[PDB]
Enzyme design. Structure first.
Site, PDB file in Angstrom:
ATOM      1  N   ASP A   1      18.481  54.755  47.786  1.00 37.18           N
ATOM      2  CA  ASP A   1      18.958  55.961  48.463  1.00 37.18           C
ATOM      3  C   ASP A   1      17.915  57.045  48.210  1.00 37.18           C
ATOM      4  OD1 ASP A   1      21.299  57.593  49.748  1.00 37.18           O
ATOM      5  OD2 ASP A   1      20.776  58.697  47.923  1.00 37.18           O
TER       6      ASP A   1
ATOM      7  N   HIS B   1      43.345  59.043  68.613  1.00 39.62           N
ATOM      8  CA  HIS B   1      42.014  58.663  69.062  1.00 39.62           C
ATOM      9  C   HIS B   1      42.114  58.080  70.463  1.00 39.62           C
ATOM     10  CE1 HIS B   1      41.069  58.851  64.696  1.00 39.62           C
ATOM     11  NE2 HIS B   1      42.244  58.258  64.587  1.00 39.62           N
TER      12      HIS B   1
END
Length: 1062
Positions: A8, A568
């Site tokens: 990361d 949604h």
RNA sequence: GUUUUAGAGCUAUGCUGU
RNA sequence: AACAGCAUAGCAAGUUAAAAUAAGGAACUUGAAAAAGUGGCACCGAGUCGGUGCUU
């Protein structure tokens, strides 16, 4: 064995983790060096690294140069000489010796002064018949007669000296050529990197508008006369202005306090670009890099209107036309000025002082100055037809060379090379033999450091990349030189700094404003809402919806927000996206219908009209209404399914591809009998949303302020997800795994029926949502819950991938593990006096009136003007400073941030020669961390009602958890920091405000974690009281302390005891 | 954008010289 | 006379190429340096990591 490493990479951290097939984190042992007897030690395989920025030798040894491209040129001409030498020693005679010796004057030539062939005839004739080089080149291109090997040599040298760039990969084609598709790419990249305030160009013939022959100002104005939403001062206007040749400004868009002028033709381009980027932020470094490809195409269009033949350079035809025009104007202008208006003729053609015409040709005059000077004469002159417009059209007397011989792809050159070679294949036998090799060298284009420096970006990311590479090499050397099976790479997004948290509010404020003025409803007049209130999802969607439900025609009440539900348009079982474009408000989600597709047709027919006045208000986008009425064109299709697959699994950032290529090249090195690259180490790249939703869904919450563990936590999770994906869908590797893999299609992945075909065929899946196999139960849009097998296995090989019962416990243990390494990179700084680096010195000093000498150790600070003199002779340096009998061997160099520890494991960090900093980190149980986060997020749960109510009961039971966290920080503080009066105030205040609400207690405890926080002491606020910093002035207790040399990653440690020395 | 070398200048006049 | 150098008065005309680029008043070991190396293996536990077995 079998393992993996996640990464990361950001501007402040580099995380690393090691897992196994069962996803366990190994724990091993390492040797201890030093001078004490702490032989026993053991650690985990999870950690992170931090480094501070600034000007340093590292930051310099990653800079920009040219001498290297220049020496690349000299070696390539030397290579040309190498190829030509043997065959000339087999064809020509004194060919090569005469051409090198060309600077010498005619008394030491020892040969003839005619380098072309050896006679005076050709010499002038050469450029008489071939004045401009294009004559010669075109002659070889379309001539079947014999030529001089040396003229071919000179021409080839010319084309390779001016070859071009490599900004486009692969062979030329309309996909990477023309104008309209590149303009489409630019607008698409803009509309991607933003989610807010978009720009729609519906079938605008951009080529006919941009390639039209106009001024540099009118061509900018031409497209600006369209695209209503944007203005010339906007970012898009600045971009299009930049990608033509003007000098825009970069102040207003980014609200910077310094004027920024940038121009592609200017030499200093990259330095200004990276200074700007390091000022603003690295996420925006994808909008300027898509205009350097549009300006190139536009200049190519401007030069190549022509193309009479096929096997010619249209640029060459244009250029030879320009030279012929230059000669013709030479003659005419000459006649006109000399005859018609005899005066000022010397002032124009001979003066050379005020930069007349001859001064412009020969002197340091510029084109703009020449045009300004020649404007009045042309304005006042008679018979000036067909001249004045071409003056400000910049096409008068143009030089054949300008600032546009860089913008130039190498495909045109290599094609003309191939044409010339084909014309002359047989006369020289080696041309056919070595055409491939000469093409290879003239197209051919270093070290790890050079590749790291190659990426165009701010130095922070480049330092992060270098540290990432070193961390990777260290990790692969820990495990006995064994290569991994999977290495995930994932970028770390920058959290909002409360500045961009306002700008998005202003943008959505602009949206609601333009909608309200376009439509005319007095919603703002009835209800005043400010940007601090725009952060509410339901409120902002309510303002987006005008106050009416869309499936049923009725107004929505304002103060019953608790009862309403958020739905949604695309069911989460098919696609996982949560942004505004796919969130709506309604009274109940039961009006969609009984199917799992886009909502039923019975609703849209009634309020089609409502949706037209919604769409034409620009408050919703074309894609949003497309998903709204997806049911009218048949419904879900294989193209849409593949589109969602690609949007969820394919990346768009090129810098991530760059670093993935770096690591793939560095690790994957073996090859086979053929020239194919055996790709034994796969490299997998993912987006942040997958890990974010994984945490949010399965309750592995993360808190950033408590300590530095979250970087390594994300490092573990990313590899965990990546191995499961690659082990579950081998055929989908071409979508996210980097490499030249075998492409696939859309028919093989999609079945016909959900339950009638699912689990009954070798095809993978039917529901478009990839991450469904992570879950154990899949919820549908109608209320039916599905059941997944306890053990997930691959049907092809027969091997298991997912264990429901074991993996969750293992992951929870990994997150709850208390011992995680964090390390600060120690570096020497390079470049009110400032201390470069302090030193530790033992010597004898005078204490008293009799000058009696005793041996002491003190911390002396070398200034930046003094280090070299310290280096040359430290003995007499310290003698002059005031010390006597210094120990050269015991003198030890100490940089900033050196780790010292004392009794009971307390650690201290050095800040200056007279101040100290904390050096220990708090460890807290996972349950307490979870409680802290949940209490902080009581109102911002943003979850389902049942989960939310369960979480608030969870919070309200454990009211004592506050009591033992205050306890926990107390004993740790008494153990380490030793700030007695400060603990006194904090516990007195805590007992004062015990009965105040748990929420308000929470964030203030989080604030109080600052005393235990790693770094320099800093002030903070309790409920109503302030605590001032306690600087650690004393520097005596470090004399008997112990130095611990903490490594780059924390794996190896060596401890030096200062008590024994001196 | 900078610096030198090689791209035979012609006609008519005058001058010094070998 | 030829030629070199001068004071004229007029007439015909331009883009290529090698060269140059900085005296500016983590820790340890071998090596000048480029660079080479240094930290054993399993099991049971888990408060900054602990214990047991093998083996350097």
């Amino acid at each position: 064995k079998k393992y993996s490493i996640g990464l990361d990479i950001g501007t402040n951290s580099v995380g690393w983790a090691v897992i196994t097939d069962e996803y366990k984190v190994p724990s091993k042992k390492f040797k201890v060096l030093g001078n004490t007897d702490r032989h026993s030690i053991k650690k985990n395989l999870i950690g992170a690294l931090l480094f501070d920025s600034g000007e340093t030798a590292e930051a310099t040894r990653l800079k920009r140069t040219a001498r290297r491209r220049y020496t690349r040129r000299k070696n390539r001409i030397c290579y040309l000489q190498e190829i030509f030498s043997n065959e000339m020693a087999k064809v020509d005679d004194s060919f090569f010796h005469r051409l090198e010796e060309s600077f010498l004057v005619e008394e030491d030539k020892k040969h003839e002064r005619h380098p072309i062939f050896g006679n005076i005839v050709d010499e002038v004739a050469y450029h008489e018949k071939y004045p401009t080089i294009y004559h010669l080149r075109k002659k070889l291109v379309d001539s079947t007669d014999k030529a001089d090997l040396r003229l071919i040599y000179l021409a080839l040298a010319h084309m390779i000296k001016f070859r071009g760039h490599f900004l486009i990969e692969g062979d030329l084609n309309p996909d990477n050529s023309d104008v309209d598709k590149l303009f489409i790419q630019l607008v698409q990249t803009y509309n991607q990197l933003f989610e807010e305030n978009p720009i729609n160009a519906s079938g605008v013939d951009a080529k006919a508008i941009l390639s039209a022959r106009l001024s540099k100002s009118r061509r900018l104005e031409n497209l600006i006369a369209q695209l209503p939403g944007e203005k010339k001062n906007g970012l898009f206007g600045n971009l299009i202005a930049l990608s033509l040749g003007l000098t825009p400004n970069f102040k207003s868009n980014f609200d910077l306090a310094e004027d920024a002028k940038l121009q592609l033709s200017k030499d200093t381009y990259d330095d200004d670009l990276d200074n700007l980027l390091a000022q603003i932020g690295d996420q925006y470094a994808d909008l300027f890099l898509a205009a350097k490809n549009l300006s190139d195409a536009i200049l190519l269009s401007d030069i190549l209107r022509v193309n009479t033949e096929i096997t010619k350079a249209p640029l060459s035809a244009s250029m030879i036309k320009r030279y012929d025009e230059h000669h013709q104007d030479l003659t005419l202008l000459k006649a006109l000025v000399r005859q018609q208006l005899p005066e000022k003729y010397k002032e124009i053609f001979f003066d050379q002082s005020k930069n007349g015409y001859a001064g412009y040709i020969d002197g340091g005059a510029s084109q703009e100055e020449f045009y300004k000077f020649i404007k009045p004469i042309l304005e006042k002159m008679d018979g000036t037809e067909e001249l004045l417009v071409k003056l400000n059209r910049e096409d008068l007397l143009r030089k054949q060379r300008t600032f546009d011989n860089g913008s130039i792809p190498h495909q045109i050159h290599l094609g003309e090379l191939h044409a010339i070679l084909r014309r002359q294949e047989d006369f020289y036998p080696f041309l056919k033999d070595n055409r491939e090799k000469i093409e290879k060298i003239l197209t051919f284009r270093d070290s790890l450091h050079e590749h790291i420096a190659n990426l165009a970006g701010s130095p922070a990311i480049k330092k992060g990349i270098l540290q990432t590479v070193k961390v990777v090499d260290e990790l692969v050397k820990v495990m006995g030189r064994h290569k991994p099976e999977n290495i995930v790479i994932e970028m770390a997004r920058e959290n909002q700094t409360t500045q961009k948290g306002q700008k998005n509010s202003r943008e959505r404020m602009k949206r609601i404003e333009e909608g309200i003025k376009e439509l005319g409803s007095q919603i703002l007049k009835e209800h005043p809402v400010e940007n601090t209130q725009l952060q509410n999802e339901k409120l902002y969607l309510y303002y987006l919806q005008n106050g009416r439900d869309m499936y049923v025609d009725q107004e929505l009440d304002i103060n019953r927000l608790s009862d309403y539900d958020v739905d949604h348009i695309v069911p989460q079982s098919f696609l996982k996206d949560d942004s505004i474009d796919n969130k709506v408000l309604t009274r109940s989600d039961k009006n969609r219908g009984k199917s799992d597709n886009v909502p039923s047709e019975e609703v849209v027919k009634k309020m089609k009209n409502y949706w037209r006045q919604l769409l034409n208000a620009k408050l919703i986008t074309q894609r949003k209404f497309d998903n709204l009425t997806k049911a009218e064109r048949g419904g879900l299709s294989e193209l849409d399914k593949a589109g969602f697959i690609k949007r969820q699994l394919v990346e768009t950032r090129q810098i991530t591809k760059h670093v993935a290529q770096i690591l793939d090249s560095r690790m994957n090195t073996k090859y086979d009998e053929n020239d194919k690259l055996i790709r034994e180490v796969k490299v997998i790249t993912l987006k942040s949303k997958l890990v974010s939703d994984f945490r949010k869904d399965f309750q592995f919450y993360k808190v950033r302020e408590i300590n530095n563990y979250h970087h390594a936590h994300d490092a573990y999770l990313n590899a965990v997800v990546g191995t499961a994906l690659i082990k579950k869908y081998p055929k989908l590797e071409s979508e996210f795994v980097y490499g030249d893999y075998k492409v696939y299609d859309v028919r093989k992945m999609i079945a016909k029926s959900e339950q009638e075909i699912g689990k009954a065929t070798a095809k993978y899946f039917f529901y478009s949502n990839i991450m469904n196999f992570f879950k154990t139960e899949i919820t549908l849009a109608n209320g039916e819950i599905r059941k997944r097998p306890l053990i997930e296995t691959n049907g092809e090989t027969g091997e298991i991938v997912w264990d429901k019962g074991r993996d969750f416990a293992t992951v929870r243990k990994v997150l709850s593990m208390p011992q995680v390494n964090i390390v600060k990179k120690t570096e020497v700084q390079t470049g009110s006096p400032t201390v470069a680096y302090s030193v530790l010195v033992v010597a004898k000093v005078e204490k008293g009136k009799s000058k009696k000498l005793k041996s002491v150790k003190e911390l002396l600070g070398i200034t930046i003007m003094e280090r070299s003199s310290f280096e040359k002779n430290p003995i007499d340096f310290l003698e002059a400073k005031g010390y006597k009998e210094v120990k050269k061997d015991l003198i030890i160099k100490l940089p900033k941030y050196s780790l010292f520890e004392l009794e009971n494991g307390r650690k201290r960090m050095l800040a200056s020669a007279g101040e100290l900093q904390k050096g220990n980190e708090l460890a807290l149980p996972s349950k307490y961390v979870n409680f802290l986060y949940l209490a902080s997020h009581y109102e911002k749960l943003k979850g389902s009602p049942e989960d939310n109510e369960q979480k608030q009961l969870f919070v309200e039971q454990h009211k004592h958890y506050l009591d033992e966290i205050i306890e926990q920080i107390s004993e740790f503080s008494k153990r380490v920091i030793l700030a007695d009066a400060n603990l006194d105030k904090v516990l007195s205040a805590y007992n004062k405000h015990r009965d105040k609400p748990i929420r308000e207690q929470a964030e203030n405890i989080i604030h109080l974690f600052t005393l235990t926080n790693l770094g320099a002491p800093a002030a903070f606020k309790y409920f109503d009281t302030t605590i001032d910093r306690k600087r650690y002035t004393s520097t005596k207790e470090v004399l008997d302390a112990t130095l611990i040399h903490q490594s780059i990653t924390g794996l190896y440690e060596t401890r030096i005891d200062l008590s024994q020395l001196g």
